[PDB]
Amino acid sequence: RPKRTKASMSEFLESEDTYSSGHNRLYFHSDTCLPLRPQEMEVD
């Protein structure tokens, strides 16, 4: 939800003074470090 608070410069002043799911990152066949393909990501 958008916060849409006010515009006071104290917003940044006090500040200075991502709902991932699934299998996001790339993977690897854990036998030779070869890049892993989703086609076989189970039987492997």
């Binding site: 799911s21 699934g22 996001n24 690897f28 066949h29 854990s30 470090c33 892993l36 189970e42």
Partner: protein, 251 residues
């Protein structure tokens, strides 16, 4: 079986009170003597195993695994026992029931077949390579054992200083007498990383007289999660070795 627990009071009131002195199993074999005070396992402070030659009358034999719901949770004293629920004993939890099959109510039945998960290989968020889980799992559930070579303290101490010079540790403290090496040979979990508050933790195992070490889930896990555990080093070591913690300042 309460007299074995009464023996266990003697077992605890003199030798097991430290609860850290753990030693390699040995066959307490008594050519003529009974299972005396100088019994090899007694001085080792453990059961007369069935592989030993303390005969069936021996009260230091572990009674049995009689958990009729399942050997997997607090009231199961075999679950409190460091050991996988013996197939010969937990007829109450399907320990030997369909040892070829993969479905049973008990959970302390992993190493006996190898109910392994499907790992992942990739770089990690925290440091270098990493290991990840494929499918959701629940808290207090098995994760594949930390398999590895078994070596002695001194060689590892000889290796560790060299290992630490390159900052290497494929070593888990096995017991007061030995240590598991995972440098060249190793499991699939060997390439995971560390958290102070990870989703999973390691539990010390006694797999049929073998000191072993698996992993169990601290919290809920769904798909695509990292896999960490507390390496439990010194604080100076931890900053030296595992300093990265992956968190910011909320308050």
């Amino acid at each position: 079986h309460r007299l074995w627990a009464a023996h266990c009071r003697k077992i605890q009131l003199k030798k097991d009170g430290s609860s850290n002195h753990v030693y390699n199993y040995q066959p307490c074999d008594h050519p003529r003597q009974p299972c005396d005070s100088s019994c090899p396992c007694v001085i080792a402070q453990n059961f007369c195993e069935k592989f030993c030659q303390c005969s069936s009358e021996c009260q230091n034999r572990f009674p049995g695994c009689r958990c009729k719901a399942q050997c997997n949770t607090k009231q199961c004293p075999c679950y409190l026992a460091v050991r996988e629920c013996d197939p010969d004993l937990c007829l109450t939890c399907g320990a030997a029931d369909h040892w070829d099959s993969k479905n049973v109510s008990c959970k302390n039945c992993s190493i006996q077949r190898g109910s392994k998960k499907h790992l992942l290989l990739a770089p990690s968020d925290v440091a270098g390579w990493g290991i990840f889980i494929k499918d959701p799992v629940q808290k207090n559930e098995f994760i594949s054992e930390y398999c590895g070579e078994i070596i002695s303290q001194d060689e590892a101490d000889r290796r560790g200083k060299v290992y630490d010079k390159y900052m290497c540790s494929f070593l888990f403290n096995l017991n007061n007498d030995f240590v598991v090496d995972a440098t060249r040979k190793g499991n699939k979990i060997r390439f995971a990383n560390h958290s102070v508050n990870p989703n999973c933790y390691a539990k010390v195992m006694m797999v049929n007289g073998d000191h072993r070490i698996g992993i169990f889930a601290k919290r809920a896990i769904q798909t695509g999660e990292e896999l960490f555990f507390d390496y439990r080093y010194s604080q100076a070591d931890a900053l030296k070795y595992v300093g990265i913690e992956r968190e910011m300042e909320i308050p």
